[PDB]
Write a protein that binds this ligand. Sequence first.
Ligand SMILES: [Mg+2]
Lengths: 195, 196
Amino acid sequence: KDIFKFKLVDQFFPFYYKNNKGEYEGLIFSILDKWAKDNNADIMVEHIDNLNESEIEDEAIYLGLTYNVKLNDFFYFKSELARSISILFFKNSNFNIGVIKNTIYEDILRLKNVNTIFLADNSQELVLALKNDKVDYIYGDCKTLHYIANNFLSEDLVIFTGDVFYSIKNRVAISRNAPEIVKNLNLDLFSYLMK
Amino acid sequence: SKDIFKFKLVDQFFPFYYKNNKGEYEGLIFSILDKWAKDNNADIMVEHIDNLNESEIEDEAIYLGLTYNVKLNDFFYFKSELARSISILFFKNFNIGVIKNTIYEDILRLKNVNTIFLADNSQELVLALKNDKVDYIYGDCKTLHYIANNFLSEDLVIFTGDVFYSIKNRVAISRNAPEIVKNLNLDLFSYLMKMP
Ligand SMILES: [Mg+2]
């Protein structure tokens, strides 16, 4: 009956990602299908590389966003998916650090007064920036960035051992101007992972 | 007197600790443990072990990389949560491989899987898949995938079927541990600063 739009942002292993062979992978559809049946509804899935405040769809449910001062004005963050850990990577003095824009990782670097921040639109772009030595470090998701890096880089990634490790919540997000029916949805997708 | 405590890092646990190409251990756990050490006014010793041998269990040691298991529960007390994982059935491009004495083993026995191949550690487990000793492996989503992808040039495929459990990774100490260890606050996760 009802049809709800889900938006997958960038990449988020293991929920959704692009493998070495360029094939879209993930178990998110398995979860969304189960959520759909429980809610007696159909779903539309859209994938977006980078989020823009001007292109926000009020009725859509966003996955793969993290808390960000800019995005907080537009979104309500609800149920948690898997958690992540922020890591600063470099390839195996003055410097510059790559980071995906409008993410919690950007805000972390900003409040640390890092002024040589290189803003990438997505994970792939960020990794390629490191490849072509546009940046000396990249900052972001522990597994997803490491994974994409190993797909494009010939050099191994190394972890920068400093005070840069934070526990990151990856939550489901809806527009603050979402219809009441969306706002009343149970969006605890993580509950479909029994324990 | 500043106390000294031994931490045993079992197998591999991405991104807390894992093997790189140089035969060394990379990870962020070492940073966390140094922080924990400062607040508890103590020194620390880190030792890596691939397998968990009952004969080699040290009562004074604090164990990381263990999950709740019917067999280990009779030897360890599982304490604070360090991180979470998702159980995934992996395959390349029917017997199932799984690390012995893990929560993952129990799951397969509860689901009444007939042909269970037991591995001692993640490295052995993923090697069994690579060498076609097993058709599927079951375990940690990040770690098993990392090893296969970085050491064996194998990008493992996730089994779509309903086999996804939320797994808690906890700190564990021996049942016969010293009183000085039992009194420790082993909330290592708290030393990972949270978002606001
Ligand atoms: Mg596929």
